[PDB]
């Protein structure tokens with residue numbers, strides 16, 4: 583079902599949360615080799631999450647589930663904010679700009695925390 587596809591998508595999102603929090607610790611500790619690997623892992627996780635979300639939205643559209651479409655449009659918009667901030671964080675790591683990396687890190691944390699009430703609303707709507 584679309585609801586079980588959303589449970590799979592949620593789990594991938596939680597995997598990225600876990601990897602992110604480990605990466606944050608590695609960044610603080612100066613373990614740049616670990617950070618590089620975690621950023622690669624996060625890129626794959628976000629790419630996969632984005633795809634699962636698009637399939638969920640497309641299915642809700644085909645089902646005529648107007649409320650779920652509305653919530654998923656808002657949620658997919660917020661996802662792209664996080665993706666842009668993530669990608670900027672990656673560039674800051676490449677460039678050795680630790681000040682920008684810290685900045686983007688906190689921003690990605692706040693954008694993600696903000697979107698959690700909507701994430702729970704979607705589960706109930708599908």
Ligand SMILES: NS(=O)(=O)c1ncc[nH]1
Pocket residue numbers: 594595596598599624627628629631632664694
């Ligand atoms: N936790 S998150 O939803 O922003 C996510 N999923 C994949 C990469 N990042």
